[PDB]
Write a structure and sequence with these properties.
alpha+beta; globular; nesg; de novo protein; homodimer; Structural Genomics; Immunoglobulin-like; 41% strand; 153 residues; PSI-Biology; Northeast Structural Genomics Consortium
């Protein structure tokens, strides 16, 4: 079985926000959505068997609360998806809103916060350039370390 | 400071369908999910202390059976979730399928029915930041009056 569908939530509101994007361990850059629906706050993907990483930020804008999670999303030979969080942290939303301006933030995490859906809009994977330095495994360690060192706050 | 994960089941297969959406008392309308995974047949939220109402519609298509339930979910200021079913009626599915168009069905009930998940899809709460009039106690009570009477 080839291409399978995978939908993620992507929406910014006054009171909350849900930013979820996929990252191809293969191409080593964010997967491009084949469709996006503002009418629903979703992004759909036409994935081909392989390994992916799903980044997810969830915010309650009013309580300055922010939930960031890194999750492994593998697609079987015949389209059987199997996930598992590999990282989940609970912190402050204002913390991430700073990372945007920190050149010490890993490329993929910087881009991730950058692409975040604008108000009453969905996120948009820009057919982009560049080539992440490390593999997938190290990439997350760079995210982990950085975010935890940002504890400083 | 408190924020508790709360997940519900939501899927629509060929043979059956389960539809559970959360209703916030404070905001007086449906809560917004932070995740929609039809892969696991669920919708996941992030709640803050307060009062919520769970609406459940469980259908056995090959029997024209639909169970309707109303639950009282409470979130402690510490985050201790606690809930209880306060209403559960059994009836034909085709009835609900029709109550939907009735001009005098409680709006919150009508919109709930409409929000039922599509095939191999999960329910999707719309940005209808709309506002109801009666408070929870009266809204729940108003739904019962209707369903019961209508049946």
């Amino acid at each position: 079985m080839s291409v399978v569908d995978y939908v993620v939530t992507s929406f910014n509101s006054t009171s909350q926000m849900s930013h979820e994007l996929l990252f191809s361990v293969k191409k080593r850059w964010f997967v491009k959505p084949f469709e996006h629906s503002r009418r629903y706050g979703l992004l759909a993907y036409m994935l081909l068997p392989g390994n992916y990483i799903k980044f997810g930020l969830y915010v309650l804008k009013n309580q300055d609360y922010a939930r960031f999670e890194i999750a492994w999303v593998h697609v079987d030979k015949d389209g059987k998806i199997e996930e598992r969080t590999v990282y989940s942290i609970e912190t402050y939303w204002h913390i991430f809103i700073d990372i945007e301006n920190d050149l010490n933030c890993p490329y993929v995490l910087a881009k991730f916060i950058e692409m975040r859906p604008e108000f009453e809009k969905t996120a948009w994977v820009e057919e982009s350039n560049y080539s992440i330095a490390e593999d997938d495994i190290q990439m997350v360690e760079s995210i982990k370390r950085y975010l935890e060192r940002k504890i400083a706050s």
